[PDB]
Design a binder for this molecule. Sequence first.
Ligand SMILES: Nc1ncnc2c1ncn2[C@@H]1O[C@H](COP(=O)(O)OP(=O)(O)O)[C@@H](O)[C@H]1O
Lengths: 346, 342, 145, 326, 197
Amino acid sequence: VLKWIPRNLPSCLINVESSVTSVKLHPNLPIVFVATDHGKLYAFDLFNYTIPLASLQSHTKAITSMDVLFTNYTNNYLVIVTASKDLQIHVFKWVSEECKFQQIRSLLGHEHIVSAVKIWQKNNDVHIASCSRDQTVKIWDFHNGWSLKTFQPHSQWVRSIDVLGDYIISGSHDTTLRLTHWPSGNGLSVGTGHEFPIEKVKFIHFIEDEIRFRTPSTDRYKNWGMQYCVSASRDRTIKIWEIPLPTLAPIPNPTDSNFRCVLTLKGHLSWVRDISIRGQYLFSCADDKSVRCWDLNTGQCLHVWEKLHTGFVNCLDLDVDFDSNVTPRQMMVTGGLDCKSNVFMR
Amino acid sequence: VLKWIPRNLPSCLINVESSVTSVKLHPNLPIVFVATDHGKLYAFDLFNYTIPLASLQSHTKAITSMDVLFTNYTNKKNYLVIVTASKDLQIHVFKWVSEECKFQQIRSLLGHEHIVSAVKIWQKNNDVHIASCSRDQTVKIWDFHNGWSLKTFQPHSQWVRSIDVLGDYIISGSHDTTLRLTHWPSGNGLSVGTGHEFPIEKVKFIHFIEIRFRTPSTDRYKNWGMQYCVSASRDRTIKIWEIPLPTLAPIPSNFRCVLTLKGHLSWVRDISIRGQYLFSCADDKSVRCWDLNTGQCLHVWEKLHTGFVNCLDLDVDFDSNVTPRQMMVTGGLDCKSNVFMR
Amino acid sequence: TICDPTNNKSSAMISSPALFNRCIINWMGDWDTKTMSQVANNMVDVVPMEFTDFIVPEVNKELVFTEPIQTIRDAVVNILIHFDRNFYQKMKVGVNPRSPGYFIDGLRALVKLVTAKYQDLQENQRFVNVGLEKLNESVLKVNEL
Amino acid sequence: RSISLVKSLTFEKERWLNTTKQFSKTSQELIGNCIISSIYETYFGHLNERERGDMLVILKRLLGKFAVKYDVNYRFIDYLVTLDEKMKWLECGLDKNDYFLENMSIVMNSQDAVPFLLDPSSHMITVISNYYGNKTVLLSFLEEGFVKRLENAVRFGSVVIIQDGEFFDPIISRLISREFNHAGNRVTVEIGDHEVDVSGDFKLFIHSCDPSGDIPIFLRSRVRLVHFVTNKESIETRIFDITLTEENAEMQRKREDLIKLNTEYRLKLKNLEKRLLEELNNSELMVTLNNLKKEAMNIEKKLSESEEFFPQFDNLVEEYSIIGKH
Amino acid sequence: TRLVRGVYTAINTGPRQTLRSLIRLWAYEAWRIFADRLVGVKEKNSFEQLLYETVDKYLPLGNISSTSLLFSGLLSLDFKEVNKTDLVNFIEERFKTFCDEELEVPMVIHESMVDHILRIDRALKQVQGHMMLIGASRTGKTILTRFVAWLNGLKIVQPKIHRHSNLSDFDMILKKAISDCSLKESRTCLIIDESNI
Ligand SMILES: Nc1ncnc2c1ncn2[C@@H]1O[C@H](COP(=O)(O)OP(=O)(O)O)[C@@H](O)[C@H]1O
């Protein structure tokens, strides 16, 4: 139900106008949203991939990252938030009545290109995170439309962010991680150990099922709700970090202001571009035109998807399994620089 | 899947500056290419059809035909090759740069003494060639890589209006009511055949699909691979012909007509085959779907264009590298083109 | 980084004891003819160049620097590289290395100007042809009445 | 009326037929003409007339060797210098000599590489200042505060000419190399230790008045050096102009007005033909086209009236040829 | 001695090897030790035929020319022999990323510049390794050094030496670079041009 391993061959081939930068999956309807370096934003069907459903040109630059969210309230649609090098964060509406796209609003304020955009909903107040080359992690509000907070946590520019509740981390070009508390806007701890810029960093959500790296150690970490964070850099490696427990507005701990690389995965041949979490398996793509699948318990590669694309594998995506509102289907989508996207079914 | 029927109402209505003569479809992308009478190429996004993605002055005279093919190299990178034929005594060959949605002119082929009417593109194991028919009553075969001539012959007394190519065998139809199947390298007429009284418009092969009209009859036909043919002329009829088997370098013997279809009211212009079905347009603004097995018209589409109708296009179903999409496209004389999707 | 290894400062850098004994000397030199031919092909294969007829000439194997001439592109890259070599030979540069920056600048100017001129010529001929066609149509309409 | 309108376009129909006849010739030989134009635009900037002619004839032979054709009557001014640009350059203050026209064309057609004005006469500083009006700024490598003023000029984006270019200051190496850090819709350049912002209309000019001067190899290799020397024809026509304006001033002014009116009428006729072709392309129109060819006939009559004064000037030129050659 | 040390680096950072692979590796090391200082094409051909004669007479094997020997550790985890078109494509994508990230300059990838990038990477990989790029202007020396330094994670430092500058400025920038190198453990790649002396 959770240990599904994809086959040796892709289930289908999807053709895109230019290089694919980001792919995401609709949590309910089996459709895939594919970004495009030319600027387009496609929306394909996993069962009828010969012709797209809808696609519009909303930027004059390359789309950098995107993610989806099936909105829920305490009182009910799907929202797509898109990053771009055009200094804008265009939020879109996916209407299921006519399977088309409708643009909602644009978030401005960044003085340069943005890299990663994350969205999460909590208590019927959904917020949109952002990170740019201004090294400013600006977080907006979807319902209101105006900004909420803004801080600079790094000397050089950030490249990727991840959120979990009220805590946000951000890898950067200066090879240093940093955990910053969003409501208070202050840093807590830093990470060190890479000599190449961080490509993608994301948290490790706890699961109740046994996996060594997705369970709390002490009661304090169970109360905090997070213990492990994983970062992928251009060092051809994957590092699982340890976040020290802050003394709790949270107060930084000077004696425990540094990270700790518990595990250091290795085996790739070039830069690791994007990473994913599913069960006890670590799914990562790189510039070796291949996708690996590491095991969190042992740290060994169990499958090599050699020559998946003819070029760089820029992105891949799974479904979130920790969240109860999303069914963790056995579907993994990947996108490459060779203007192709591979979708794995069953 | 392969039994798709287009809807009664078109899904996209595209406007251009002048009359449309040739419409082709991208084998891998939802992009449509149309040619105008001013020698202008328009590359259109399907979901954004109002503003042209690309607009280029390909020729100084009217474009007549156009063909596309995605190259496949086993070594090197692949790209889409578009060919335009016009009344400038020239043939132009472009590469479609999909990275930034802009045309790029690869090369040109010169040598015809009058206007050129149809140009085809087909890929060998690692090489690509091109054929052309002209008012010079001459079939000429060029290559895309070097650019100089490889074959030239005059098969018909009248001028050939349409050529189709498969393997090393060429079927050509002229202003004269006859067709001809010739061999590619030797340039000899393997078979001829009459049966019309008005000029042929479009003629093409009927390939094999793994059925009454897609199956080899004998083992002596399976190894050769060519059995049927389809033709259409101003006789308001569509004729399915049988081919005679040449004695194998081939040595040449007449055409056999095995089916005829009638029901058009004016000159037909294009013939397209998708699986079991046949799509044809006729100058009474009539788009008709015929069944090869039963042998009668199934669905009609009338008054699609205020003026005449010029051509249709559907994806190739008998090639591995081309996905048979559930879509169809057509053009008219009234600055209009119709796209049917799903 | 040394541009002219003949000058006094560069000679002092080269002939210095510890700089010579520690640094791995990598003589870039001027570009050879194969490199210039390759880069010229790779930055002129993206322009409308072959649009008229062409007859391959008869030249010596060592006299041609590229692959045997087939299209306009090989001819123009050969003519550019051969003229650049002759121009450097005529200026009496000696054993001083030859900067290929002039070659690159001229090739960029060539591709830009040929694109502009081809577009202008095609537009002008289309305009004159549609004007002649309109005049012929007006003549036919006047003769009909 | 339609018959009269058709009969009124016989000369234009003949011109169109001749142009369509000549299209095959002018397209078969386009690549060679473009090759010669590019060679002029990139190589012969820092050369004298004799050396230019010598490499011209060897390039003609070499180009004909590889079986690519050109124009036998090819000329650089007729190929690149458009008539409106020629009018603007002559109105700015540059002389009527053709070599200076070629060098001004090669200067004002290099938008990718900054040019090097090697002008001993020190008047092209003021003609280029006149070309861009009062918005230009004059800088030098020998002035204090040069860095800050150049930064302000970059931020404003005005046309900048830097004089005394043989004393090159290497802090502008990022502007000479034309390497740009594209930051969204803004382009930034690191000069010294703090970056600036390029306004997008910034243009750089380097002018040096020292013949046989010294310049760094880094500056030389990336900057289109163009020479500016007085040849025989320039001094000949200048001597003729001085002696004619010191002999008959009103007659000289009348001749200058006559030639200015003639070239203005030629430019107006060319624009008139282009406007007529553009108007006929998009198709009231009959009366408009009547006005068009009425203006054309008026211009032709004015030129034919102006034709009857040139042999006198030819006689004066033949008289003063001995003074010019001495 | 430099040849022996280069062979040691290639052997230690390499996969399992065969006798033909040892011959190719030793010949590449000889090419990068003895033949880089050569200037003439005739001298290069003489060195190539000398290597032919030496290998044939003392070691009783494909073409050994400079463009036919590309040893690099960029495409994998080990210093192995690589192919041509895959390396050209990979370095094309890496250069496009570098132009996106640091500065845009339109240079075209070709064979000799790929070989020069590989040898610059080999020289900068060595401990206490320094280079003397000698060649004509606009050949692409300093920008290639910048690109290779970016590939290996080196920080790029260029001295801002200009007119009306004395030895105090040079000492200041040298001391700043030294302090960044040592105190801040930042790997720096100083680039000294001829015009900066
Ligand atoms: N392979 C190449 N293709 C095209 N242009 C090149 C190439 N190599 C160098 N250049 C040109 O040279 C310039 C960079 O040279 P650079 O290394 O700065 O010279 P230097 O070492 O003398 O400072 C660039 O502007 C580029 O246009």
